[PDB]
Design a binder for these strands. Sequence first.
DNA 1: TGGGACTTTCCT
DNA 2: AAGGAAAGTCCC
Lengths: 273, 312
Amino acid sequence: AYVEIIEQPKQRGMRFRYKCEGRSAGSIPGERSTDTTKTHPTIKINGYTGPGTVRISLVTKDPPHRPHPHELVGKDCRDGYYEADLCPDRSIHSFQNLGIQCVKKRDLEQAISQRIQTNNNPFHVPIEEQRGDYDLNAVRLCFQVTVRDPAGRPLLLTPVLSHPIFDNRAPNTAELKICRVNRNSGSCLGGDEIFLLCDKVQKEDIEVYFTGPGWEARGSFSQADVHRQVAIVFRTPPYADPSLQAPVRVSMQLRRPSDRELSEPMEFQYLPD
Amino acid sequence: GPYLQILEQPKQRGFRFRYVCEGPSHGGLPGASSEKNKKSYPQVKICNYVGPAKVIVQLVTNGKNIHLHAHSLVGKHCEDGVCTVTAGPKDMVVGFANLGILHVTKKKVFETLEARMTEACIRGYNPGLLVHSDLAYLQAEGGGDRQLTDREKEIIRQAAVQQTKEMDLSVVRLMFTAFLPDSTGSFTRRLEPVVSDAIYDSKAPNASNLKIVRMDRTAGCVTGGEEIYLLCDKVQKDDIQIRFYEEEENGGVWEGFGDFSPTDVHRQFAIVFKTPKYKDVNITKPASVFVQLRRKSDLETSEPKPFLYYPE
DNA sequence: TGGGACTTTCCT
DNA sequence: AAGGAAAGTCCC
């Protein structure tokens, strides 16, 4: 009888683990999560509060949100989906025991083929759509949450997808980081070669973005200048003022065309002449 | 009567094994003398000529107790990993062209190993000099198929159980065996096998060839302690070092090492380090010295790259 | 032939 | 158990 996620799952940062992969290793981090305080996904059933069942499941990112292949093993989690009674004394019920078992392409047909043969489908999406190409680096959480009625019957409440979640391993779903650079400054004239050590990046799809108020440009460099996708050797871009006169600390960050994603910011002081 | 001669062994490093998945041709196991603008292959040779002869070669293991390695030496005359070459007459020197090593998985080791021991024991290949010391009669016997009975199977299979446990899938060794004709005209005379040196998979993170691809700067002050970025080929985080050295006339000593930590090797492909003090910080004219990637392990080294020290 | 990068695993 | 690297795989 109504519901809305209080703590939206993590965005682009977590990493999809496997079966063989460390089991019981980790869990599912929440919105405002932290390196010192976690906080898992919790859904608040405003108003109504009492006994209720819960079946959490993972679904694709786009429009027809079909059930996603990846399991979600952990406490009580079955066949892939999640299921367990909800505290029949409190409302907003949390979930600290969820793991995302990403599957191999190998066993995919089977994986989704389980979703059906095991009835899994928070949006009763047609079975003819329950197949074909699926994206394995992006998923959403759904809450097929059921409770009682004004009296005492099985009043099922409408599902709701949790913000996107992305595989960190996928080199184009991963978090674009800037680990360290040699130079930290340069001339407004631009052209100061720089060595940027960074996290796995895809040369075909990556850029070095220089922001700064009223100024926008990118470092010149070719693909051959991206070493084992973990280092780039670009040349600093000409600042707006060909005759600056003082430190104008601007910002430098890695950018991914496709995703349109921007790495954290790093300062690059533009000195004069 | 005679013997074999490893004439020209294999390059020993730089070769990358391949899994069945890689399929197509991917080269030929190099000679220890191949140098691009001239390439060779492990060549063998006999001495006391025996007209015609058959020399089979199989991959053995680099352990104190030479055994059969799971990897399969796939090539031309090869089949099940026993490339058989018919040493031409008069010319007792037949080389082995583009061989190529096949990499078994860690799961297919005992599985693939059974066959290797099964075979040979059949085809008459090397007398339990690799399998066990209870056979030795896996040569010819006389005639038949040598099914060694369903009994003997227990030693082979169980031999494939204690070897598969220590087997190292990263290194192999050739095992050249020569067979000279007999009365029947067949080749039954086993000439003492001669194992090769030792070939190291290049795919392995510590057997690959070291190379310095890029350095943001190739000059520093004799004082040293000037940061530098070196982009490299996969190097093992805690087993690599930067060596600066010089050809000193009065002998040829002096060597320096960059100062960095494993925590300064960016994802096995980059190294950020500080430069070492040069010998003569009293220099007035800069001096050209060298830099070189070196593996603390085997001490293998990259082609040295120039570095110029200038005074303070 | 010669070689990068991707996918799945294993070791912390 | 969040992250680094080795092992196994595709596709130039």
